[PDB]
Tab-separated table of C-alpha atoms and ligand atoms in Angstrom:
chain	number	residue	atom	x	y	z
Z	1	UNK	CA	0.000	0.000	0.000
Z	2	UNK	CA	2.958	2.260	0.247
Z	3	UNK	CA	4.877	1.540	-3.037
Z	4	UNK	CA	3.170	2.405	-6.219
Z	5	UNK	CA	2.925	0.069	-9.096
Z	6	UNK	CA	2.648	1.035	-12.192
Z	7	UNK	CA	1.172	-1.616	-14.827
Z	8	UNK	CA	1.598	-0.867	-18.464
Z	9	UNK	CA	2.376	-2.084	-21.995
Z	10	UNK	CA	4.103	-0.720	-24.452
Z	11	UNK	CA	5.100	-0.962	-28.115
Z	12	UNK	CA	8.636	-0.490	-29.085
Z	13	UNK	CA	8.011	3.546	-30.255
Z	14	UNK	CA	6.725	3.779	-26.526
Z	15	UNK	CA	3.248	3.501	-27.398
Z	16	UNK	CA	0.486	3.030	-25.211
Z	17	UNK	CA	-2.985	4.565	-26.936
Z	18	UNK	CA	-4.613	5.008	-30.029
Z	19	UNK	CA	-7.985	6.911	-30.740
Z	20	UNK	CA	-8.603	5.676	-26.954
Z	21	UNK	CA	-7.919	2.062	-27.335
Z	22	UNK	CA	-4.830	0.040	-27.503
Z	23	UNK	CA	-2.887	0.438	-30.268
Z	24	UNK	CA	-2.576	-3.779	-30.847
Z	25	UNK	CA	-4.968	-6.315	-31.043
Z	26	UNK	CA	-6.367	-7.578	-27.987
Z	27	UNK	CA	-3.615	-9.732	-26.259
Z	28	UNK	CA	-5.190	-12.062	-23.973
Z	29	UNK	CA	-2.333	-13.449	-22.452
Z	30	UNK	CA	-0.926	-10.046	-21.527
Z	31	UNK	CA	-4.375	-9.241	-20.355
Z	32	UNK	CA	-4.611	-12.403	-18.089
Z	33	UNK	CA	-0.618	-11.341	-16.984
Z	34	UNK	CA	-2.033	-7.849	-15.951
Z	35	UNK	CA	-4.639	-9.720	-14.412
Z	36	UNK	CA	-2.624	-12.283	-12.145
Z	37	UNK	CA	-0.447	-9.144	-11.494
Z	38	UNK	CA	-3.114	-6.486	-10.226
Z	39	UNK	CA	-5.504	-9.359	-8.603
Z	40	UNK	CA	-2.785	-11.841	-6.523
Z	41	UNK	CA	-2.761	-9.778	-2.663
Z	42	UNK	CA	0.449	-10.893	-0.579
Z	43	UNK	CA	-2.152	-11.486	2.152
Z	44	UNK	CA	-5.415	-13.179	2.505
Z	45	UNK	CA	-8.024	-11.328	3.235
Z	46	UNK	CA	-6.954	-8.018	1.879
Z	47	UNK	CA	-7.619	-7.262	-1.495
Z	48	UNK	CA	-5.282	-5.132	-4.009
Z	49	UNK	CA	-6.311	-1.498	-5.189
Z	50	UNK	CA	-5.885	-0.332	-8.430
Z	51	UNK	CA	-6.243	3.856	-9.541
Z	52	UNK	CA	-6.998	4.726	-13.184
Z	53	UNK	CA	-7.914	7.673	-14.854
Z	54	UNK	CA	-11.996	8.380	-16.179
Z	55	UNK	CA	-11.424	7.619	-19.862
Z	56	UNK	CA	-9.310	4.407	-18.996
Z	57	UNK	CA	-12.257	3.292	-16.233
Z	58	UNK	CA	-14.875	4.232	-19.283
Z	59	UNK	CA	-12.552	1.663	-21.927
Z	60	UNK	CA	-13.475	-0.650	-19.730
Z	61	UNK	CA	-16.268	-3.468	-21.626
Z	62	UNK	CA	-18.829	-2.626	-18.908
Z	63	UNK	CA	-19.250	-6.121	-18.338
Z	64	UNK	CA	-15.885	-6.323	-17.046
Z	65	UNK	CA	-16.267	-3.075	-14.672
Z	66	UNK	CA	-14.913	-3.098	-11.399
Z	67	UNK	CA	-11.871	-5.100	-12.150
Z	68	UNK	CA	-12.988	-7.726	-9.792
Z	69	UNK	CA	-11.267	-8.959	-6.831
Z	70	UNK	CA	-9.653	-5.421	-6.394
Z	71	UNK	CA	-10.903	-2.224	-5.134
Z	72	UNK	CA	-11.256	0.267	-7.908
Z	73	UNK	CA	-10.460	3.849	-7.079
Z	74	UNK	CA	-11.099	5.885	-10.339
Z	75	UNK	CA	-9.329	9.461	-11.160
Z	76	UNK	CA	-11.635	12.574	-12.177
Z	77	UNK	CA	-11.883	16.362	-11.661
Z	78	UNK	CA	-15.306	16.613	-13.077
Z	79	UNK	CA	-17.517	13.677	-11.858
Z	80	UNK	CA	-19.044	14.245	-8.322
Z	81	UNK	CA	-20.327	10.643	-6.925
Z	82	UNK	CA	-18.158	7.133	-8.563
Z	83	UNK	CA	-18.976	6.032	-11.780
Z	84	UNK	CA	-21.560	2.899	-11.014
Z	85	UNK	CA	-19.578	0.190	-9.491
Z	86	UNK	CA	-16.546	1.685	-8.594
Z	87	UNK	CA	-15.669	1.792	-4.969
Z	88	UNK	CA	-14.074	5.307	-4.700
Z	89	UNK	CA	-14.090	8.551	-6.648
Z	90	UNK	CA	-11.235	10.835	-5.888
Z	91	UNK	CA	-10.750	14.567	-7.515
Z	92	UNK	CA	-6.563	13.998	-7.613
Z	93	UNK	CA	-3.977	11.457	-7.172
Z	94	UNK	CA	-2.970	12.865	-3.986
Z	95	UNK	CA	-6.299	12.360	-2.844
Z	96	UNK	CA	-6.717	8.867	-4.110
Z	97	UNK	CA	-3.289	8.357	-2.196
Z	98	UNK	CA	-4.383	9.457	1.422
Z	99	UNK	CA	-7.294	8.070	1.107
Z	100	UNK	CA	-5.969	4.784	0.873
Z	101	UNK	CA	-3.681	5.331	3.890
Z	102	UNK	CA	-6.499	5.872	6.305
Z	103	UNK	CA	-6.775	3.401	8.909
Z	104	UNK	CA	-10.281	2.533	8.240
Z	105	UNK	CA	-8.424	0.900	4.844
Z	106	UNK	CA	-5.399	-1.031	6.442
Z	107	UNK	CA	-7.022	-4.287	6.751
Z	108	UNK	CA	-8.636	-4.155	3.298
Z	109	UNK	CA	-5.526	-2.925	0.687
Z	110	UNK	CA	-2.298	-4.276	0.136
Z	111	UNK	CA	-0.662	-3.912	-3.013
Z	112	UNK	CA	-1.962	-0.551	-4.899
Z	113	UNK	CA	-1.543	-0.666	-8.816
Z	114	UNK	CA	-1.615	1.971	-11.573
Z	115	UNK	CA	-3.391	1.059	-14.140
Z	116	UNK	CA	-3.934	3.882	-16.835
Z	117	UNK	CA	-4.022	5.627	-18.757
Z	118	UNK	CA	-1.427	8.448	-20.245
Z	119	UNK	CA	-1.818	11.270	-17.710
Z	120	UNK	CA	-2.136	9.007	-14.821
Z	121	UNK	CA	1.368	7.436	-15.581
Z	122	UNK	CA	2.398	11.061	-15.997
Z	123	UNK	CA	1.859	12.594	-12.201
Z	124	UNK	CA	2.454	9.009	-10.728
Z	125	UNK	CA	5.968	9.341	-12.299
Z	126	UNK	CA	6.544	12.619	-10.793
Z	127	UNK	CA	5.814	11.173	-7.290
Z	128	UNK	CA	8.710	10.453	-5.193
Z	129	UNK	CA	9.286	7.627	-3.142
Z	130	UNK	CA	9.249	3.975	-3.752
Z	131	UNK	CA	7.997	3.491	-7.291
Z	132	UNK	CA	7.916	0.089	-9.258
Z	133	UNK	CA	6.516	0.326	-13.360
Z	134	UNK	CA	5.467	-3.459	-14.556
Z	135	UNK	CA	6.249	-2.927	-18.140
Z	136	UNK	CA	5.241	-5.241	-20.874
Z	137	UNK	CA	7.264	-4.509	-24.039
Z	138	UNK	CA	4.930	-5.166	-26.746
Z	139	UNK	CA	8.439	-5.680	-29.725
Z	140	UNK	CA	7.042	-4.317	-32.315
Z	141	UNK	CA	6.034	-0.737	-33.856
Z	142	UNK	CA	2.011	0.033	-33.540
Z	143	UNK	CA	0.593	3.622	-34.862
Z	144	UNK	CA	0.014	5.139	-31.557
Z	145	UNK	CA	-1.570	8.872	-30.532
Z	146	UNK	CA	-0.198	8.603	-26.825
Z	147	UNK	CA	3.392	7.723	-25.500
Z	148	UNK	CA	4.997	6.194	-21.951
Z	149	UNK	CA	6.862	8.915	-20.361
Z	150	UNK	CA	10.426	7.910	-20.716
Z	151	UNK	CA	11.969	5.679	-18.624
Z	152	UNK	CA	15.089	7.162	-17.282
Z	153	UNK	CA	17.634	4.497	-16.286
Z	154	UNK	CA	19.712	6.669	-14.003
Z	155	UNK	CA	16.097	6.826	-12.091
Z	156	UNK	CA	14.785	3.239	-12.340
Z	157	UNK	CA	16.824	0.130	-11.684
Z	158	UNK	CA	15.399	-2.790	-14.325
Z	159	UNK	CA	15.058	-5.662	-12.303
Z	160	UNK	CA	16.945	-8.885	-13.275
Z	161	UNK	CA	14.360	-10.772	-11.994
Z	162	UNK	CA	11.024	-10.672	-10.117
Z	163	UNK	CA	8.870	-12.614	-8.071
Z	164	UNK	CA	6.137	-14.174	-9.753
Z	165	UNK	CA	7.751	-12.647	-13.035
Z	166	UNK	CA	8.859	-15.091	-16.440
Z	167	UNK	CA	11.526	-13.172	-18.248
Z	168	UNK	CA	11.453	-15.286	-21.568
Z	169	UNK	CA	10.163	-13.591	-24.245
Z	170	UNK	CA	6.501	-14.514	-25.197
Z	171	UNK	CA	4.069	-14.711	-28.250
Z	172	UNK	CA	0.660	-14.192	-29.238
Z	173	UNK	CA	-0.916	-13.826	-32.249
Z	174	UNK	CA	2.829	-13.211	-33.884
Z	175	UNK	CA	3.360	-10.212	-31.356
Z	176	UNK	CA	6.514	-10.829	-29.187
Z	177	UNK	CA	6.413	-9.423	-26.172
Z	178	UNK	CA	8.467	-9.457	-22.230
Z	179	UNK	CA	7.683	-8.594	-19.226
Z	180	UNK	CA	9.956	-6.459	-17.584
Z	181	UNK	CA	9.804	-5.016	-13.520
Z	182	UNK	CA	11.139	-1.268	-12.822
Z	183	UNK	CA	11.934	-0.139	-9.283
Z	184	UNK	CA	12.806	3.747	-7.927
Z	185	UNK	CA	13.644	3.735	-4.621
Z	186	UNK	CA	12.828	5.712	-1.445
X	1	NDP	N1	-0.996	0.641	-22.888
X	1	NDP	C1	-1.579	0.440	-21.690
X	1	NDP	O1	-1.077	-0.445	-20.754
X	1	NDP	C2	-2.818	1.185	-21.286
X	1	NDP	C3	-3.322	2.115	-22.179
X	1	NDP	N2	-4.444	2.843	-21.878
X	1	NDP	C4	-4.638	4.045	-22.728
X	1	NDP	O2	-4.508	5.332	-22.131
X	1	NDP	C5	-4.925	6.266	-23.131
X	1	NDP	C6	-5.624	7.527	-22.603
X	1	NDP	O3	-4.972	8.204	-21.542
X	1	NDP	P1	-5.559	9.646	-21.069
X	1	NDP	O4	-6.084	10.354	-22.278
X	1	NDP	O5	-4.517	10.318	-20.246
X	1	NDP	O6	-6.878	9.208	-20.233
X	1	NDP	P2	-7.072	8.682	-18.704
X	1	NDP	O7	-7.460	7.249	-18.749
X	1	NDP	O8	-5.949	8.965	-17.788
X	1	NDP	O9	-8.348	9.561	-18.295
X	1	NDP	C7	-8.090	10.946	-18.168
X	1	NDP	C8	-8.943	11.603	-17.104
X	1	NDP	O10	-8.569	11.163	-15.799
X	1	NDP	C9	-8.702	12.210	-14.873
X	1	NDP	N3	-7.367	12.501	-14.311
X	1	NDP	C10	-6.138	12.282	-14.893
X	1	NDP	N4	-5.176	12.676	-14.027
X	1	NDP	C11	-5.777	13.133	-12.899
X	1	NDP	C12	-5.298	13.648	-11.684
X	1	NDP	N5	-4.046	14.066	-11.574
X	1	NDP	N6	-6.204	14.016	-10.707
X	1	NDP	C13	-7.558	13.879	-10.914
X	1	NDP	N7	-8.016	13.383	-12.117
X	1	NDP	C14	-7.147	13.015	-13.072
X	1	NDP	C15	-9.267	13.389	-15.661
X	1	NDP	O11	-10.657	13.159	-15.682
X	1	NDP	P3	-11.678	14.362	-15.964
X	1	NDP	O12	-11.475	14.842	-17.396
X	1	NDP	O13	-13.065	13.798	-15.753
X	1	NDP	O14	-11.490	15.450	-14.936
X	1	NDP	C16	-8.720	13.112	-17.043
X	1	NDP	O15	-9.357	13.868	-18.057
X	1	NDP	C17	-5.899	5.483	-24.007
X	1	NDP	O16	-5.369	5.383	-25.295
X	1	NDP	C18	-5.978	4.082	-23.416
X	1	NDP	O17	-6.094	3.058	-24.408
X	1	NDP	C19	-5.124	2.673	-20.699
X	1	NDP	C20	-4.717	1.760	-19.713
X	1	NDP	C21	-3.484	0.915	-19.933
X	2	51P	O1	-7.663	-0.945	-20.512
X	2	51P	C1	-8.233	-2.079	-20.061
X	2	51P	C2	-9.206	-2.755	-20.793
X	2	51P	C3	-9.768	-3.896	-20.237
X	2	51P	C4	-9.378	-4.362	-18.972
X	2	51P	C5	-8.398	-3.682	-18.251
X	2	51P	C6	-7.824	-2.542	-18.820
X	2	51P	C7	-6.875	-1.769	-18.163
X	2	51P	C8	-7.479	-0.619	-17.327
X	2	51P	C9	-5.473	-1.891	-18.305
X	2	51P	C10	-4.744	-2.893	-18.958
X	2	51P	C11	-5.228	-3.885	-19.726
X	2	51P	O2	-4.160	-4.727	-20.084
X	2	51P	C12	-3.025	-4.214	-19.537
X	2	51P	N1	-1.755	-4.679	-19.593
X	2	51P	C13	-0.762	-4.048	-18.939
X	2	51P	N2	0.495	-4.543	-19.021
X	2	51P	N3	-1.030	-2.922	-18.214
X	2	51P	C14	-2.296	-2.412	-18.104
X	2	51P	N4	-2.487	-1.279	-17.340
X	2	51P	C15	-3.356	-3.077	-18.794
């Protein structure tokens, strides 16, 4: 609950969005990656929390809104109650961030997750403090309207391994892609 994960993919131009979807086809197996990732709590009987920004909560198929299993917080300046089924609505990141430190949370959050989209990545990057980004390099080019920040190495350390983490390089559909773990410290 105190280090932030980020959670992206990412095509090899740094890619991340196009025309408000994903500039790939759907990859299920990254999908059910992100899935194990945001969903599997260190602890039973406290569920992980995962932040995302309006548009990214809207991209959602409604059928698969909340992400279930996890407490969804989602970002806006301009909605006044949550969107229907999401647990919390909070008007900033900073917000979103205390609120899950209150005590009436502790025994109900452990891992928190980023999740989305562009401008979320943006101000969680500028955070300081402990900081891991999940990246999934998507190794290929993909027309794209919306970019990852870059990833300064002098910043973030790449892991050479990670718990719960397969480093070989994977396929589906003809799309390689890895999964790669981030970490900035402090
Ligand atoms: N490649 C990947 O792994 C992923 C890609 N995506 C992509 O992300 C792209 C879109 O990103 P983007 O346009 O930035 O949209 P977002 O999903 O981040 O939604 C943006 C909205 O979130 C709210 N918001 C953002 N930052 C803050 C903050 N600091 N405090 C309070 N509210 C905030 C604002 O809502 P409001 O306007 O209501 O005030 C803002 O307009 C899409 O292409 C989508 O496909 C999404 C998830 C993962
Ligand atoms: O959009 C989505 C559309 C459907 C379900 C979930 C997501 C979200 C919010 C995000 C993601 C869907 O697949 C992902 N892979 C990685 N590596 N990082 C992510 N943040 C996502």
């Amino acid at each position: 609950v105190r280090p932030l994960n980020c959670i992206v993919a990412v095509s090899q131009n740094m890619g991340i969005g196009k025309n408000g979807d994903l500039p790939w086809p759907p990859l299920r197996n990254e999908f059910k990656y992100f899935q194990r990732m945001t969903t599997t709590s260190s602890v039973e009987g406290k569920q992980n929390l995962v932040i995302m920004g309006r548009k990214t909560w809207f991209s959602i198929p409604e059928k698969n809104r909340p992400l279930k299993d996890r407490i969804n917080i989602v970002l806006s300046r301009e909605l006044k109650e949550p969107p229907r089924g999401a647990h919390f609505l909070a008007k900033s990141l900073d917000d979103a961030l205390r609120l899950i430190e209150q005590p009436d949370l502790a025994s109900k959050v452990d891992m928190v997750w980023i999740v989305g989209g562009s401008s979320v990545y943006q101000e969680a990057m500028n955070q300081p403090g402990h900081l891991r980004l999940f990246v999934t390099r998507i190794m290929q080019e993909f027309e794209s309207d919306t970019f990852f920040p870059e990833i300064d190495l002098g910043k973030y350390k790449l892991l050479p391994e990670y718990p719960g983490v397969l480093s070989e390089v994977q396929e589906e559909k003809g799309i390689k892609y890895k999964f790669e773990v981030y970490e900035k410290k402090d």
